[PDB]
């Protein structure tokens, strides 16, 4: 947590009286950045994170037919995800032998964990955990701009919607319940992350709430958690897109991580 000085760097002076983007919200009401292209200088951020020797874990579950998505997912992650930084891929799968042999860049590693003491394993191996769906591909840069204690990503189908249209859990009997007059954003579970400690907090809360609903005979739990524990960054839909369903709107300067058609 002691941080060394940055080196001399040459880049354009930020302009106090020029908004960064005039077409989108770039900060939430609790002062968390909303990550859009144009908001960050990746050279500055790369320096800051490299100087801390940052390691990023990327976790994916690939069960049954979803193993078929791993080759493209990992090949494209190699091109676009945290390039230059230490990356540990964690692939959770029922088919260890079906994980494709993907060639990795230096400083990058992959663990296969079979699914039908180790939570501490993430704590000792990585600084940040990023949790994504495997039936996706990277098409453009996804880097250290996303890293923060806790982040969620705007659901691409709902970023322009009013909160009453959000498909939050609406049954008051559920632990996930959000009433019509509450809600900041509609976050999608396909891309979230943060420090290991904050990600483990989130998944522990979600698991307990789901068990409680289960006992009572009942994205919703994620959305409840992030309502009540505000993320320290929010990722724009550049980070979670479906071009076939939604096209390429002008508000998206890049399409970084997308559904496979």
- Residue 170 CB, nearest approach to Hg ion (Å): 16
Q: Is 206 in the site for Hg ion (CB under 5 A)?
A: yes
| 15: DSSP letter | -
**Which residue is associated with the tokens 């919200």?**
25
Name the residue nearer to Hg ion (CB basis): 38 or 100.
38
Q: Is residue 90 within 8 Å of residue 61, measured between CB atoms?
A: no
- Residue 20 CB, nearest approach to Hg ion (Å): 3
| 202: DSSP letter | H
Q: What is the CA 196 to chain-centroid distance, rounded?
A: 13
Contact string (CB under 5 A) for Hg ion, positions 16-45, x = contact: ----x-----------------x-------
Q: Is 222 in the site for Hg ion (CB under 5 A)?
A: yes
Contact string (CB under 5 A) for Hg ion, positions 114-153, x = contact: -----------------x----------------------
Q: Count of residues binding Hg ion (CB under 5 A)?
A: 10
Name the residue nearer to Hg ion (CB basis): 159 or 225.
225
- Residue 99 CB, nearest approach to Hg ion (Å): 18
Which is it for the CA torsion 31, 196, 152, 187, positive or negative? negative
Considering all CA atoms of the chain, what is the largest pairwise distance in Å, rounded to the nearest integer? 60
Q: Is 155 in the site for Hg ion (CB under 5 A)?
A: no
Q: What share of the chain is helix, strand, coil (3-state, %, to 5)?
A: 30, 20, 50
Name the residue nearer to Hg ion (CB basis): 156 or 194.
194
Q: Is 210 in the site for Hg ion (CB under 5 A)?
A: no
**Hey, which residues between 46 and 85 contact Hg ion (CB under 5 A)?**
59
Among residues 132, 178, 209, 226, the one that binds Hg ion under rule CB under 5 A: 209
Strand order in the sheet with 86-93: 34-35, 233-235, 150-153, 191-195, 128-132, 55-62, 86-93, 108-114
Q: Is residue 170 within 8 Å of residue 142, measured between CB atoms?
A: no
Instruction: Give the binding site for Hg ion (CB under 5 A).
Output: 20, 38, 59, 131, 205-206, 209, 221-222, 225
């Amino acid at each position: 947590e002691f941080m060394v000085s940055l080196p001399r760097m040459v880049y354009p002076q930020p302009k106090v009286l020029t908004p960064c983007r005039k077409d989108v919200l770039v900060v939430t009401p609790w002062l968390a950045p909303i990550v859009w292209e144009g908001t960050f200088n990746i050279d500055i951020l790369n320096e800051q994170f490299r100087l801390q020797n940052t390691t990023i874990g990327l976790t994916v579950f690939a069960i049954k037919k979803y193993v078929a998505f791993l080759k493209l997912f990992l090949e494209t992650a190699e091109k676009h995800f945290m390039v230059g930084h230490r990356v540990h891929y964690y692939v959770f799968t029922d088919q260890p032998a079906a994980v494709p042999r993907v060639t990795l860049g230096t400083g990058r590693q992959l663990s296969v964990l079979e699914v039908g003491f180790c939570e501490r394993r993430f704590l000792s191996e990585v600084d940040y955990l990023v949790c994504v769906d495997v039936d996706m591909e990277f098409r453009d840069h996804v880097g250290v701009e996303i890293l923060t204690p806790l982040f969620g990503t705007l659901h691409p189908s709902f970023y322009g919607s009013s909160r009453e249209a959000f498909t939050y859990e609406r049954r008051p009997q559920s632990q996930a319940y959000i009433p019509k007059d509450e809600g900041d954003f509609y976050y999608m579970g396909a891309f979230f992350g943060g420090s290991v400690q904050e990600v483990q907090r989130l998944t522990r809360a979600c698991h307990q709430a789901m068990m409680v609903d289960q006992a009572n005979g009942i994205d919703s739990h994620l959305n409840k958690y992030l309502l009540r524990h505000k993320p320290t960054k929010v990722l724009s839909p550049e980070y979670l897109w479906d071009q076939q369903l939604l096209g390429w709107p002008a508000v998206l300067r890049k399409l970084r991580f997308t559904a496979v058609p």
